[PDB]
RNA sequence: CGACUCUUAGCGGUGGAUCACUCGGCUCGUGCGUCGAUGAAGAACGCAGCUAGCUGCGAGAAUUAAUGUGAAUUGCAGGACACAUUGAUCAUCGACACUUCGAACGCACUUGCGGCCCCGGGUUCCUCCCGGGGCUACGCCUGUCUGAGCGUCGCU
RNA sequence: CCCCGGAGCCCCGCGGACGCUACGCCGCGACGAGUAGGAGGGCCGCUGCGGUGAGCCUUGAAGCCUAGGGCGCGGGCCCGGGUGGAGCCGCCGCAGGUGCAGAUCUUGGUGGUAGUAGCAAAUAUUCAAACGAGAACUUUGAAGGCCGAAGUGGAGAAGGGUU
RNA sequence: CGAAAGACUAAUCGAACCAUCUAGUAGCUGGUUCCCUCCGAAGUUUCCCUCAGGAUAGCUGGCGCUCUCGCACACGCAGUUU
RNA sequence: ACCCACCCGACCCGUCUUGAAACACGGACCAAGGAGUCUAACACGUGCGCGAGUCGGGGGCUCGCACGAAAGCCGCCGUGGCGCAAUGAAGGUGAAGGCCGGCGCGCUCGCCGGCCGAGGUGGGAUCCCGAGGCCUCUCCAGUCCGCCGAGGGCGCACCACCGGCCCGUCUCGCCCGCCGCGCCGGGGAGGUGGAGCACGAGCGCACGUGUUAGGACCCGAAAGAUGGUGAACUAUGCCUGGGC
RNA sequence: CGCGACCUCAGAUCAGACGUGGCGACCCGCUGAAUUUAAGCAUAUUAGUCAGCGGAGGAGAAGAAACUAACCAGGAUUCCCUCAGUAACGGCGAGUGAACAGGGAAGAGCCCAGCGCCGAAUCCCCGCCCCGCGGCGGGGCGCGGGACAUGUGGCGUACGGAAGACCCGCUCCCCGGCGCCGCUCGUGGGGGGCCCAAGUCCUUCUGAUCGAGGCCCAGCCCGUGGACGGUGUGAGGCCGGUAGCGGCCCCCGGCGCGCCGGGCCCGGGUCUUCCCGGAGUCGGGUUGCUUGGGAAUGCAGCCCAAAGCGGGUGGUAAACUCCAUCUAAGGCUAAAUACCGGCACGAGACCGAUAGUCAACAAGUACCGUAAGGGAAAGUUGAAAAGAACUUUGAAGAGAGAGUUCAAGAGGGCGUGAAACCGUUAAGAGGUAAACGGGUGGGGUCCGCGCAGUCCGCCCGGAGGAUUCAACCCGGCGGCGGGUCCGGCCGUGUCGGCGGCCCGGCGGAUCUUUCCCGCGCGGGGGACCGUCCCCCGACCGGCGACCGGCCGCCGCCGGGCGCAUUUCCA
């Protein structure tokens, strides 16, 4: 259950919260899991997805073992566009198909300074949690 | 419903003589809503017949003794495997029906422990059933934070939370009760009398202190004893084929004299 | 229009009563709010009685109540004077003091005096600094209790 | 058989019921309980690369600064930026800014007329002329200055 | 002059339905109009809540449609087929903004009337060409007409507000 | 306001319009939503500023209770008659 | 159950009405909406809990309420409500009687000891006793079991009647009492008023029906009041222009 | 005829302050109807209610008795329960209608004028320095101004106070700063930020799965986390979250210690001598309104108009009298209480687009009205725009192919797509308008058949094939029932132990203060009574309350039994 009496559990309120979320919050929502290779390495389950991560689509039509680079993150549409995840429109032109980040898995992260520090913080809180449980 | 709801308009009746129908009609304007119909429960816009008030008598009060009677009955029938089984609880493999347990069960601080216990006591097919029952509620409840529904599970009466109520918490179905503070809404859910319970020796001993035996007062609820019985031999078959009774009957006329 | 036997009864719903209906959906939240407030005051007034001050034994007026005895508002001045408690000071040790109570009978006076005597005996005056001067009780009767008194201080039983 | 009419069914229309949804309400409860001459509430007019409305803002006008965040924004453009850098974007908001009416304050409501001090062109304080800046409501309190009275006295 | 774990049974007292949801089952009689009105029973119906059906449901929920098959005195209900595309029902209790033919009812929609009444105030039009997919109506030219300077002309006020 | 018609006062006048009090009051019109089953009326009484309404009796239904004995073994009651 | 045929029957519903197929009103058609509600108070009926009690509020103690604004508990458990006692305008008063023996003159009056203790008549479901049958394969004896039972009893509830008691009130009468002897206090007999007593039945909760007060089944006035907006039409005055 | 004090009055764009409007749920002060009820209506009622005007605050108002009472007396206000639908009012009709006591929530008490004493001992504003400065403050220093004796400050206010003499005991309280220590209850106060468990595992459906089956214990894993939401269907484990006395980082609060700067020589009782109270106010008359307040509850105007062992009240006018009770005509004050406005949250047996707010949407919008004012309608393609390239007919709108999609039998007002109504296709009919009830018939539509439906089931007889047992014993297991209650556990009624009684507790208006402790009372013992528990024996209901052996019966397994038995099959 949820006990904290300032949170909500209320369809309409959590749905409003979602569809009217502001960019910086939508970053957090549009996270996706890391691969079991990276999970082992960094001690982190999931990361906010970003413009040029390498990525596998997991479920849907484009469900495959091809590792495509992310192209752009459309936070207004809650979706990401991926290198070869595309479909031909009527008139031959290609169009990047939207994939929701949660149905994607990150194989190669784009490591900047900030991202590194996020990974370091998450792994730290995990290890504190494991030490507390022990 | 709101006090104003319906009456926010200013609508006079065009009187009789204009054809139409002696309703109060919205005054003037170059809108759709003009010469329409206001106020009458029948009208669109309108105003519901006898608007619901806040001061409806929502709460309902009950005599103390009657509540205590109720809770005795409910306890009484958490024994009786028939009634428990009829209330749907899969109590086939359970070892002894007023199921009392060691008081390390106060100890437990992890669900893992709490679940293993239930599996040892063979109560786990009840939770396993609750898991199977989990499904979408039909109807408008769905859009009012009653979206999922499932079974009631085993009750667990504990004497003191030394950790237990954390351990049994995530296990779906299980309600926990303090003995000192029993509840009829939980021991007899749906107003239905059976319900499989799992007692703790510490709690189970305390019942006689709480409710009192038949020759001892409550000794905890000031002035209270158990309700008396209206008849003692409840199995009437034993009575009806006794020597004392059948000795004094007329012999049964059972020929059938048809027309 | 009345119909064949009943109470010829006069309900008072001729004023705009629905404008002034007072529902009671508060009451739970109210009770909780009161109990929270009460628990706060207890925590503030640390080893003092939560109850409040000690209050005088008092007879009820009128032939009806007459035989009963209540807590009163505060100790009369004559009562304090007899006990040997300065009226301004009594308020600082947790003794209620009204000065509107006359004192007719000697029987009521002496019993109330006895009360203040008893209170002074079983009271633990902390010193102003932790470094102890006169009056302030010993560090024994201090460590053993900086305890509150739950319920009314020295309760009255008729 | 013929046309027409009536009935029933199939398909198609018209129409938008029903059902299923729900970023909206309604009700009950909790906490706080804060507007304004330092110019409020309200009104007006403006402000976007393409923008009418809604919203957001005030000539610094879809916002500036700062702080947190850490790559977008995205209808299309265009761009920026080195996202190993105060750094995109959001959020917060403590600094800064905030057109005109409005209690509304120079007097009037035309958007009309003004007075008085200082500054720049204009002069070379020559007042004009132009532009800029700051004052110029009523009431009342404490003090201040200047005063009034065959009000009550004193000295001359 | 004996035992039913065996008389063999039309009566069996040794044990007892195929029957016995005892709110069940069974038997005999009698009776049955009904407004206003009253009462009872509805495994009649609607929506939501506590219970409960190891219920149902993308291998197709609700709703909708059906010259398909049935049940019920009836309220109604169940099955088949189609359509549809996401939820829904049985039982036991609780609760109600719970059942429509009418109210010159309310809101929305559609008929017949009906291709009907009608598009009749102030004399008037005609020929050619052009453009154009297309001309009774546009434009140009030609002719015939009217307004007839108290104008159907040329300028303003108010009002409109980009005409 | 009226050289007077009760004229005019923004298509409104023997008392304008707008909002509220207001869901104003109505012994009076109109309407009032599923099934079966059983019982089933009244339009007369007295009183009433009562006569298109109430009250009260009557007539109806519902709930019952107390007894009775077709369990070879009956008392009481009647829109009769003697 | 779709269509068609034929014979017989058969007027259009709703409504007010003594009387509607009506030359009575409402109704072109379809969809969705649409009217006996809720609160309070009383009454009677019914169900449950407890019973001379009952009661729960209001409050308090137990939790951050996930479910809880619940649930539980409280010398508060009873301040208090209702009930357990009436009757009188009120001051007030306030439900017992019998019997027996003795003492005062038994005076259908006054005082002292013992016994019983809510009276009696009729009718009363029902219990209780029961003569006597009625047989058993025989003549008698004879305990056991029934069945019926004439006849007799205790008699619930309830009804009718007669007594009794309390409070008011009248009439008539004779005695008692003491810190205060008095315009003091207390009794008796017989009538008569009381929503009285005469071995208790209430309290709480829930459901139903009825009757009210509330918008009060739904829709409906002509009106009434308070506070505001209008003389751009028109009425009349004035100012300043224009016209014949 | 000047100059100077003061007094009363002016003027300033004089120096520096304040007020003005809004909001209005709640609150205070006025003002104040009428619908309505009374079955009419005028008093009454509606109602001190709507409308009107004024003024506030986070609450307001109220509040420390000119109070209740009549008691063995209580002791500010406010709030709840109760008093009580009562006392009372009332065309005594309709109707209206409080208070005290009692129990709770909370609890807090104070200050002036006066009377007096103290060299005005007081205040404001200037100006210079040190600190402090986003709530203008402290300290110092100025012959620098003014306010003030027509009265500022200290003491002091009815609970009495002052001043004196000696009885006693002894001396911390406040603020301006500057630091520093313990992050200080939802169990780390408040705010902000960023973090933290576990499947996308195997098969298989599907357009897509969050589905279906499985996975070392209902299956794997976490579970202090299986709330909710999102994600191409239904997701504890995909993501956000959720749980947790979980973490880290900021900021802020609140309290604890140190240092400094200032202020501050601040008691109590006992005996004496003094001191003491708010006027056009009370009170009376009165008229008007108001109240339950009735020969006047409260508030008003007018007229009269006080006292000081007085004055007020003591619910029937008045006189006389005793009692009781307060001390009016000046002021402040937190708390429980209110809250349809605001900001920010949470929840619901509510509504689910003719509902719910007028308003789910560019709604107080469009639109109307000169204006006051009125005031709508209007949600849904799909998972994703993949929103139909291209060919062709047409001036085009429109089509026909082609294509996207699981589907366009989802095509931009597009989910589902009812009825009325209309087109057509098929069938059937047709001079008494249609439609209807009953009864048959004819035709259609589908539905069940049958390419014999002769439907099954027992038992039996026969003729064919078929394996293994029933019967019988033997060994084991399990179940039933039984009495000898045999042996022991189990419990009802009774009796015995007075045995638990102090190693058995509660209750009691039973007793005792021979007791103990604390102050005649409270608490605890100690007797006593009622109630609940041990010991064994006896009798009895031997009770579904159980065990152990023995018996009898049944069933299952395993042995044997080979075929006049044993089932199977046709
Ligand atoms: Mg509405
Ligand atoms: Mg539904
Ligand atoms: Mg208290
Ligand atoms: Mg009938
Ligand atoms: Mg869908
Ligand atoms: Mg509802
Ligand atoms: Mg209809
Ligand atoms: Mg024509
Ligand atoms: Mg002419
Ligand atoms: Mg022109
Ligand atoms: Mg012209
Ligand atoms: Mg005339
Ligand atoms: Mg109505
Ligand atoms: Mg009438
Ligand atoms: Mg009529
Ligand atoms: Mg008719
Ligand atoms: Mg006729
Ligand atoms: Mg008519
Ligand atoms: Mg008609
Ligand atoms: Mg309907
Ligand atoms: Mg009853
Ligand atoms: Mg009645
Ligand atoms: Mg009603
Ligand atoms: Mg009306
Ligand atoms: Mg009138
Ligand atoms: Mg103001
Ligand atoms: Mg009237
Ligand atoms: Mg009337
Ligand atoms: Mg009238
Ligand atoms: Mg009044
Ligand atoms: Mg008002
Ligand atoms: Mg105040
Ligand atoms: Mg005062
Ligand atoms: Mg009081
Ligand atoms: Mg009462
Ligand atoms: Mg009144
Ligand atoms: Mg003074
Ligand atoms: Mg989901
Ligand atoms: Mg989920
Ligand atoms: Mg996670
Ligand atoms: Mg009045
Ligand atoms: Mg008197
Ligand atoms: Mg005040
Ligand atoms: Mg809609
Ligand atoms: Mg709509
Ligand atoms: Mg709407
Ligand atoms: Mg709809
Ligand atoms: Mg619509
Ligand atoms: Mg639609
Ligand atoms: Mg729709
Ligand atoms: Mg489809
Ligand atoms: Mg579709
Ligand atoms: Mg849809
Ligand atoms: Mg559609
Ligand atoms: Mg058709
Ligand atoms: Mg044809």
UniProtKB/Swiss-Prot annotation, chain A:
Q: Which UniProt keywords apply?
A: Cytoplasm, Isopeptide bond, Phosphoprotein, Ribonucleoprotein, Ribosomal protein, Ubl conjugation
User: Where is this protein localized, as stated in its record?
Assistant: Cytoplasm
Concerning PTM, the database record says: Ufmylated by UFL1 in response to endoplasmic reticulum stress, promoting reticulophagy of endoplasmic reticulum sheets.
Segments carrying the region annotation (Disordered) are 1-21
InterPro entries given in the database record:
KOW, Rib_uL2_dom2, Ribosomal_uL24_CS, Ribosomal_uL24_euk/arc, Ribosomal_uL24_KOW, Translation_prot_SH3-like_sf
UniProt cross-references to Gene3D superfamilies, sorted A to Z = 2.30.30.30
GO biological-process terms attached to the record: translation
Q: Name one Pfam family in it.
A: KOW
Q: Which domain of life is it from?
A: Eukaryota
An MF annotation (GO) of this entry: structural constituent of ribosome
Gene Ontology cellular component annotations, sorted alphabetically: cytoplasm; large ribosomal subunit
In the record, the note on similarity to other proteins reads: Belongs to the universal ribosomal protein uL24 family.
Q: What is the annotated role of this protein in its UniProt record? A: Component of the large ribosomal subunit. The ribosome is a large ribonucleoprotein complex responsible for the synthesis of proteins in the cell.
Q: What is the annotated quaternary arrangement, including any partners?
A: Component of the large ribosomal subunit. Interacts with DHX33.
Name of the protein in its database record = Large ribosomal subunit protein uL24
Protein source organism: Oryctolagus cuniculus (Rabbit)
Gene name tied to this protein: RPL26
From Swiss-Prot, chain B:
Q: Which residues carry this modification: Phosphoserine?
A: 237, 242
User: Which residues, renumbered to this chain, carry the PTM Omega-N-methylarginine?
Assistant: 44
Supply the gene name: RPL4
State the similarity comment: Belongs to the universal ribosomal protein uL4 family.
Modification note: Citrullinated by PADI4.
Recorded protein name is Large ribosomal subunit protein uL4
Question: Where's it found, cell-wise?
Answer: Cytoplasm
Gene Ontology BP terms: translation
Whom does it interact with, and what assembly results?
A: Component of the large ribosomal subunit. May bind IPO9 with low affinity. Interacts with RBM3.
Query: A single Gene Ontology molecular function, please?
Result: structural constituent of ribosome
Modification Citrulline occurs at: 247
Provide the positions where the record notes the PTM N6-acetyllysine: 53, 206
Taxonomic superkingdom:
Eukaryota
Q: What is its main location?
A: cytoplasm
Q: What does UniProt give as GO cellular component? A: cytoplasm; ribonucleoprotein complex; ribosome
- Assigned keywords, A-Z: Acetylation, Citrullination, Cytoplasm, Isopeptide bond, Methylation, Phosphoprotein, Ribonucleoprotein, Ribosomal protein, Ubl conjugation
Crosslinked positions for Glycyl lysine isopeptide (Lys-Gly) (interchain with G-Cter in SUMO2)?
186
Which residues of the whole protein are included?
Answer: 54 to 312 of 413
């Amino acid at each position: 259950m949820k006990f904290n009496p300032f949170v909500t559990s209320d369809r309409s309120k959590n749905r409003k919260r979602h569809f009217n979320a502001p960019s910086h919050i939508r970053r957090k929502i549009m996270s996706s899991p890391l691969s079991k290779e990276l999970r082992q390495k960094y001690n982190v389950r999931s990361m906010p997805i970003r413009k040029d991560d390498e990525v596998q689509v997991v479920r849907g039509h484009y469900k495959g073992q091809q590792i495509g680079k992310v192209v752009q993150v459309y936070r207004k549409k809650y979706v990401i566009y991926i290198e070869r995840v595309q479909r031909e429109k009527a008139n031959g032109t290609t169009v990047h198909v939207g994939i929701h980040p949660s149905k994607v898995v990150i194989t190669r992260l784009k490591l900047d300074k900030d991202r590194k520090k996020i990974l370091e913080r998450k792994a730290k809180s995990r290890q504190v949690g494991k030490e507390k449980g022990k | 419903v709101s006090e104003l709801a319906g009456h926010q308009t200013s609508a006079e009746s065009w009187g009789t003589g204009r054809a139409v129908a002696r309703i109060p009609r919205v005054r003037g304007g170059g809108t759709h809503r003009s010469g329409q119909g206001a106020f009458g429960n029948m009208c669109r816009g309108g105003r519901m017949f006898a608007p619901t008030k806040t001061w409806r008598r929502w709460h309902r009060r009950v005599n103390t003794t009657q509540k205590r009677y109720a809770i005795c009955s409910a306890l009484a029938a958490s024994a009786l495997p028939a009634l428990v089984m009829s209330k749907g609880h899969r109590i086939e493999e359970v070892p002894e029906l007023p199921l009392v347990v060691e008081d390390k069960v106060e100890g437990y601080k992890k669900t893992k422990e709490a679940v293993l216990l239930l599996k040892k006591l063979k109560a786990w097919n009840d939770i396993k059933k609750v898991y199977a029952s989990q499904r979408m509620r039909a109807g408008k409840g769905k859009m009012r934070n009653r979206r999922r529904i499932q079974r009631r599970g085993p009750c667990v009466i504990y004497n003191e939370d030394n950790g237990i109520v954390k351990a049994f918490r995530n296990i779906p179905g299980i309600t926990l009760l303090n003995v000192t503070k029993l509840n009829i809404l939980k021991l007899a859910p749906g107003g239905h009398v059976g319900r499989f319970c799992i007692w703790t020796e510490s709690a189970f001993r305390k019942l006689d202190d709480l409710y009192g035996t038949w020759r001892k007062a409550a000794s905890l609820k000031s002035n209270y004893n158990l309700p008396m019985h209206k008849m003692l031999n409840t199995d009437l078959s034993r009575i009806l084929k006794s020597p004392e009774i059948q000795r004094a009957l007329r012999a049964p006329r059972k020929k059938i004299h048809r027309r | 229009a009345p119909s064949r036997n009943g109470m010829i009864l006069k309900p008072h719903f001729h004023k705009d009563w629905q404008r002034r209906v007072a529902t009671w959906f508060n009451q739970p939240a109210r009770k909780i709010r009161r109990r929270k407030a009460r628990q706060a005051r207890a925590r503030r007034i640390a080893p003092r009685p939560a109850s409040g001050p000690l209050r005088p034994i008092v007879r009820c007026p009128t032939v009806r109540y007459h035989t009963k005895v209540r807590a009163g508002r505060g100790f009369s001045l004559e009562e304090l004077r007899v006990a040997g408690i300065h009226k301004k000071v009594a308020r600082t040790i947790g003794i209620s003091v009204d000065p509107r109570r006359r004192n007719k009978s000697t029987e009521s006076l002496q019993a109330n005096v006895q009360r203040l005597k008893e209170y002074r005996s079983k009271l633990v005056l902390f010193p102003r600094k932790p470094s102890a001067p006169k009056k302030g009780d010993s560090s024994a009767e201090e460590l053993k209790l900086a305890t509150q008194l739950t319920g009314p201080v020295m309760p009255i039983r008729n």
